[PDB]
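Hi L.,

You mentioned the student needs an example of a multi-chain input paired with its predicted structure. This one should do, with 1030 residues in total across all chains.
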Amino acid sequence: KATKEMLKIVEPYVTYGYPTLSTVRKLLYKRGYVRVGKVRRYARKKIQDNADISKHLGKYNVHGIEDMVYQLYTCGPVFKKVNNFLWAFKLKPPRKGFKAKRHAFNEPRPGDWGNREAHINELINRMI
Amino acid sequence: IDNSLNTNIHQYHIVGRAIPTAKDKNPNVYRMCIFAKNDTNAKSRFWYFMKKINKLKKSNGELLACEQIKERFPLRVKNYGVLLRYDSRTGTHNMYKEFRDTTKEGAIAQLYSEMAGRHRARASSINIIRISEISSSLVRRPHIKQLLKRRLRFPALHLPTLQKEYRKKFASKRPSTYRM
Amino acid sequence: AVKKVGKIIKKRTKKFTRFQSNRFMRVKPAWRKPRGIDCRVRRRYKGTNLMPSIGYGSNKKTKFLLPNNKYKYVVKNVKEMEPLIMNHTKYCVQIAHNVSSKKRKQIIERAKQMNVSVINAKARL
Amino acid sequence: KHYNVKGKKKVLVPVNAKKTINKKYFGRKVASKKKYVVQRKLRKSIEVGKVAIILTGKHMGKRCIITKILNSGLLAVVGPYEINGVPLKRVDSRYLVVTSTNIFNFENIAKLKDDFLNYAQDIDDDSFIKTLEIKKKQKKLLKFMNNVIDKIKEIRKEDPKVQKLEGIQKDIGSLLKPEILKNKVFAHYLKSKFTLRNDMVLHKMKF
Amino acid sequence: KKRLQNKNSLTNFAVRCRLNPAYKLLRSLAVLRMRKSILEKSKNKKEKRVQKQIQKKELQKINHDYYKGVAKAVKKKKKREEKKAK
Amino acid sequence: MYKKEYVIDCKGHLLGRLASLIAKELLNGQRIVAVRCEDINISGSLYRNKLKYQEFLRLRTNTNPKKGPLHLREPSKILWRCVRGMLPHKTYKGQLALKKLKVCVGMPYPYDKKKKYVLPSALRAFRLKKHRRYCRLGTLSSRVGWNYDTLVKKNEVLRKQVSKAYYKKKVNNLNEKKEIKTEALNLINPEQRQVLENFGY
Amino acid sequence: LQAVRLYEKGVILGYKRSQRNQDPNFTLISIKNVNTKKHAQFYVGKRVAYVYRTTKHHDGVKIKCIWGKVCRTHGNSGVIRAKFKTHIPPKAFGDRVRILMYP
RNA sequence: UAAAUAGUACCUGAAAUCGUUAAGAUGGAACGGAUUAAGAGAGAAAACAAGUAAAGAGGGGAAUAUUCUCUUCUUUAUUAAAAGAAACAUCAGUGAUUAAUUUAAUUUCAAUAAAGCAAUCCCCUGAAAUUGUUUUCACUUUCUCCCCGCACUAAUGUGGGGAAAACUGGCUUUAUUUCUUCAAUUAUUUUUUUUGCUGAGGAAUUUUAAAAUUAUUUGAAUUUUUCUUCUUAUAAUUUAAGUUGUUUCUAUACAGUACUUUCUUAACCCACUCGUCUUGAAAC
RNA sequence: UUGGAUAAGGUGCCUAAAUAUUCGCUCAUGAGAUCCCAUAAAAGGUGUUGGUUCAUAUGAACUAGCCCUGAAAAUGGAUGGCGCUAAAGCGGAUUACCGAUACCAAGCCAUAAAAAGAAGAAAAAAUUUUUUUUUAGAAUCUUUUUAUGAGUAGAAAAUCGUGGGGU
RNA sequence: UUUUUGUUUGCUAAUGUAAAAGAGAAAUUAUAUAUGUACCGGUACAUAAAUAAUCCUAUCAC
Ligand SMILES: [Mg+2]
Ligand SMILES: [Mg+2]
Ligand SMILES: [Mg+2]
Ligand SMILES: [Mg+2]
Ligand SMILES: [Mg+2]
Ligand SMILES: [Mg+2]
Ligand SMILES: [Mg+2]
Ligand SMILES: [Mg+2]
Ligand SMILES: [Mg+2]
Ligand SMILES: [Mg+2]
Ligand SMILES: [Mg+2]
Ligand SMILES: [Mg+2]
Ligand SMILES: [Mg+2]
Ligand SMILES: [Mg+2]
Ligand SMILES: [Mg+2]
Ligand SMILES: [Mg+2]
Ligand SMILES: [Mg+2]
Ligand SMILES: [Mg+2]
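Structure written out for the whole complex:
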C-alpha cells in the first residue's frame, strides 16, 4: 500500500509494470550487479559466480542467481533482502526509443510515464 | 504482414466491480467494450468511465476480466455507424458518423483521424458511445451510400507511390500521371 | 587527439595555451587558469580553449616514460651514473646542459660501458 | 580435436605461443596460455572446383578456379596458367568472390575430378611461404633497373619449392586445359577479367 | 581479485552453467523438444481440433452473449433518446 | 549525382522543390545545368506570385541601393537565387556549390545536344492537384520587367524544328539497327541465340 | 578496357553530424545505386579507400590512400557511415571514394 | 684585440616597434578551439639486426714483465630475433543487422473433393416483439431470365419493376494439409545470416577451485535421446581463467619524399572584448 | 577517450534524419507553420468541411473546424532563410530514422572509500651450456576493487617557481 | 602540330587539380493523355504508358 502511494507520488517521473519471469531472468543475467562489502561500503560487482551471493544470502537459504530470480518473480519470504543486495539496474536507453517521456502511457496520445502493467516487459527487452 | 499500414487500436471487453464491503457484500459488476491502443490503456479508459458514471474508482474496485475482441470476419466490408461525444474549444457535442470498414477497430482508427482532421478534436476529448454495423437500408450518410452502389467501378486517379529503390531523383523521361 | 605509439597512450598532444595568449603579447602562453566572471573559458563554452584537468593524466604505469619506454634521469657527473648500472633498461641518461665537452665525452663513454642509453649524445659533437 | 558447446562443434587446431610478455613483479612469461585455436571454418559456398574472382592482387579481376582448401585456412587457386595467366596462387577466402559456377558440374570436365583432387592434395601450405635465405638473396641485389628485376626473377625461379609448385601447376594445366578449351564460351569466361559496370549494382547481384 | 571482462552469462555457456547448475538439463530438454519432426505435430493438430469443439462453442456463447448485451444497451439508449425527444 | 554534369530540363517543374533538389546535389558535388528556366512553374496564382515578387522588389537598402537585395528578374537568375537561398553560400564549400550551378534560358550551345534529365519529385503534374492555380515563371518575370520572353519563345520554336529533324534521323537509325539485329540473330550460333532470347535481347 | 573497376563508386559527404556539431570520427558515404537501408546493409563490412593525389611525391608516388571499414548504415536513404584509420579531411567532402568488394 | 655585431651612445642586449629576404594567405576584420590534410622545417634516444667471424685503432682489469680475459670505436660479411603497423583468422566483451524456432495461450484461418442443408436464405448482421429464449422479415450472388425505358448507361451495358438458381457465399458433414493454409499477439524457448567497435591485465598458488568440452570408466533416471541428464574415477583441453596466432610491410634502413614531431597554411563545424561592479555585460 | 543506444527536438534544402507511409481539413488580391515567444478581439461570411435540431430533397434554424473580413506606422524584411499548396500548412495515426558533455559497455586520470600487504625463478633465444631482459615489498608506500567527478564567493590539501640562509 | 625526357644572388629546369576509372545516353509534349505516320487545327491508322526497373558500350592480348 505504502509502496503504491510512493509510486503515485513519483508517477510522472517513472514507468513501471509487472516484469514477467523471462524478463526478470534476463535482467539478472545481463544486467545484474550486486553489492559486495561490509555494510555501507559496497562495490558494485557483477554476479557470474554464486559464491558472491551465497555469502551474504546464505543465512536466508538463497544460494545462486536462480533462487534470487525466483524470489524476485514471486515476492518470497526473502525478497526484500535480495532486492537490497541487487545494485539498482543501470539500463541502456531503449533501442527503438520512447514515445514521449512528457506524457503518460494511458494518455490517448503517445507517452510513457504510467503503469504500463504488462508492456513494461517489452520496454525492458528493448533497453536491456 | 504489413506494419506500415496498421493502426493498433483494438477492442477490449473489460469487466470490473467495486471491492465488496461488509455493508454491500454483493456489488454490481459493470462491463464495456472499449477501443484502446493496448490492454492497459483499455483498463484505464474503463476506470475513467466507471468514475464518470458510477461512484467507482480504481482503488476501490477490481478488474474481473479484460478479454480483447478480435473481429470475426476481418476481411468482410461492413458499414459501421458510430456515436461520439466530443469537446471543442468552445463546448461539448454529440455526433453520429459512419465509416465503411473491415472491422470495428479499423472504423475507430478512421474516426479518430477524421475527428482530428475535420474538427481538430484530439483523442483525449472524444468518447465513443457505441459502434454498430448498419445494414445498408438504414445508411444515412451519402459518402457511404455511394459505396453501397450495385456494380461499383472507378478509375485509379491516385499517383504512383513507387518504392524508395525505384524513386530516383533524376529521370530520363518525364513520367506520366495518366497511366491508362 | 589521442596519440598511441605502443602501450604509451597520450590523451592530449596539444599544449594548453593561456586564454587570449594569441591576442596580446603581454599574455604568455603558459597556462594560467582564468578566474574572473564572464570568462567563457572558465565557463567552458564550445569553441574556446580547453582547461587542463586531471582527466587528461597519463596512466600511472607509463607516466613519465618517454617514447623510449625509459624514465629520463639527468646526470651531471660520473658518480651519478652509478645508480643506473642496475637499471640500464628502465632509465636513460640525459647529460646536464652545463656539463663541459670533455666531461660530456667521459660520461658518454661510461654510458656505453653500462649499456645505458643517452638521449643527448651529440651535444657539442 | 574439437569442442561441441551449444551445438556448434568448433574444431581445434594446435597453435604455438610466440609472444613473451613481461610478468608482474619477476620475469617474463609467454602470453598465450591457450594451446588450441578454433579453426577458420570457410563459408558454405567455397567448394573444391568453383570459379572465383581474385579481387585484390596483381591478378586483379582474373577469374580463376579454386584448387585446395589449405588447412591453414586460406586456399589455393589456379587460372590453369596456360589458359588464364593466373599461376598456382594462394589466396584468402575474403579476397575471393566465389561464383555459383563449378568446373566439375560440366558434363565433359566432371570426369577428371579424382586426378585434380590428387594433384591438390600433393600441394602443401609450406610450399608457398618463401624461405629467409631466398629473401636475403633478393634483397642483396639493391646494393641498374631492369637488370635487377631480371635477377630477382631468376632467384625466384631457382627456389626448389617454387620449382615444385610450377611443376604442379603445369601438371594441372595438362590435366585440365584441353577440355576447357573445347568448351569455348567457358574458356573465354575463364580468360576474361570480371568488371563492375553501370547497371551492375552489386548489392542485387547474386553471383 | 583483479576484475576481468565480466562474462555474458546468457550466452557464454560455461558461465551460464556455473551460475545456474540446472540450466544444462533444461537446455537439453529444450533441444530434445526442438528435435521432434513435423508429422507428429500435424497429427496432434487433429487431436487438438477434436478436443477444442466444446471450448470453441463456449467461447462463441460468451462472445455472442457480450454482443447481445451491447445490442440491448444500444436499444435502451435509443429508447431513452426517443423519450427525451417526445 | 555520380555523373559529370546533369542537365536538368526545368520545364514543368515546381520552382522551390526543383531548387531544393538541385541544392542538395550541388552540395554533394555535382555540376548541374538547369536549362529552359523560362518554363519553371510556381504553385501560387500568377497574380499572387507577382505580388510576392513586387514585395521582394520593394525591399531594397534604404541608404544606398547599389548594394542590398539585387532583384535579378531573368527566370534563370530567379532560379539561381532560389538555389542560393538553400545553400550555405557564405562559406567556401557553399560558394563552390553555387558556382557549380549553371542556369540558362531556353537551351544553347552544348545543352541542346546533352541529354536532359527531369526531377519527378518536383514536377508540377505530380505535385499540384489540377484544380489549383499555378503560374509559368517566364510570364511572371515578363510581368516584372524581363522583356526577352517572346524572343526566347521564338528561339525555342526554332530549336524544336531542328530537334524534330534530328529525331527523325535517330528513329530511322534505330529502325535500321533493329532490322540488322533481326537479320543477324539468324547468323550467330543456336545456343548463344537462345541464351540471348532468354535474357531479353 | 585498360584497368578494371572492382569497387562501387562513392561520394564522401560530411562527417556524422548534429545540426552544428561535427563528430569527425565518422564520415558519411553515398554509394552509387544504393537507395535504402537494406541495400546499404549489404556493404556494411566492406573496406573503403579514399585515394587522393598530391603535388609532392611520397613513397615515390603522387597518390596516397586512407582506408576505412564502412561501419553501419545511416538512416533510411542508403547512406553509410564509414570509419577511417585516420580521419578524412573536409577538403574531401565532395570527393570520390572507392568501396571495395573485399571481404 | 682572444673577441670590435667589445669602437668609447662601448658588458649581456629581452619586448613593444621597424627593416631585409623567403614562404604562405588575401570577396566588408583578424586571431582562436576541435579535427584532419597539405606544405615547409627539424629529428633516430622505441621507431630493426643482438652476437659470431676476419684485423685495424684504442683503453682497462686480473693471474704469476706477460700470459689470460673484458670491453669502446672503425671496418669488410654474417646470421639473428624483437618492435610497431597493416591484413586476415580465433576467442571474449559490447552492439547493429535478417532470417527464423519450440511448447502453450488467446471465439483465428485457409484450401482440398466427395456428400448434403436453407433461399432475402444462411456464418453473421440489422429493424421490430434484467438476462437467457421463442417467433417476425430484413439482409447474398450473377457473365442467369422476363417486362417497361427501347441503347435510355460512367461501364464491353444501363434506370426502374419483377423472377430464376445456388455456379457465388454461408452452414452441416466425412476424411485430407507440401494443391494451398497453419495468422497475429502474448507467454515460454532455441538458434542463425552478415557484421561494427574494444583487447584493460599479465595472477611466487583464488589464471586455483569448480563450470564447460573431449576421449575413456562405475551406477541410476524418464525428457529413449550421435549436445539425454546427473555421478564413480582418469587424463587432457577452452566455451573457464579480459587476444591470441599466421603472413606480409616498415626493412636487410641510419634518414629519403617513408616514419615521429614542430610550425605554416587551407577546409568542415564551432568560437562575441578581456578585466570589472551587477539579478543580468558581447554590450550603446 | 572509443563504441553503442536514446532524450528534448526534429527528418524539402540551408541541417544530421522522411520530398516516408496513412487519413482528413485548408487556397488566402498581404495563407499558415510548433511551450515560454515575441500579439490579435468583439462582430460578421449563400467560402468550404463536418455535424445537431427541425419541418415539408428542398427549406429553415443553429453548431464548430479550417479559411476570409474585421487587420492601419513610420530604414527594407523576415514561419530563422529559401521556399512550400497530391505541403515542406493545420489535426491525427503509423513506422523508420537523425540527434547531447544525459544513458549504456570498455579503457585511462584523479578523489573517496574498500579489500590486503613488513621472499620466490619465469620465459625466450642461441648451441647440455651460454646470452637476453626482469628476479618487486619506498606504509602519506605497493597491489587490487568499487563508486564518483559541474561550480562564482569562499574553504582546504598537494604540488610549481623566484631572492637569500644552514646542510 | 608531333616526338622524347621530365616537374622525385631570391630564383634562373619545371606541378597543379572541390574531384576519371564506361563520370556512356540530344525528340518533343500532355499530365482527365501524348507522340509519330498518311491525308484535309480536323480525320484514320499505328506507337509509349514501373518511360535509365531501359538501351548503348567493354574482356575476343600480341
Ligand atoms: Mg520521439
Ligand atoms: Mg516539465
Ligand atoms: Mg555572471
Ligand atoms: Mg677563449
Ligand atoms: Mg654579440
Ligand atoms: Mg664582463
Ligand atoms: Mg652592447
Ligand atoms: Mg573594398
Ligand atoms: Mg453451394
Ligand atoms: Mg594486453
Ligand atoms: Mg558561429
Ligand atoms: Mg543595475
Ligand atoms: Mg564582461
Ligand atoms: Mg559517444
Ligand atoms: Mg539512432
Ligand atoms: Mg540531409
Ligand atoms: Mg522543415
Ligand atoms: Mg570540481
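You could point out the following to them. The first helix of chain C runs from residue 78 to 81. Residues 95 and 104 of chain C are 7 Å apart (CA to CA).

Best wishes,
N.
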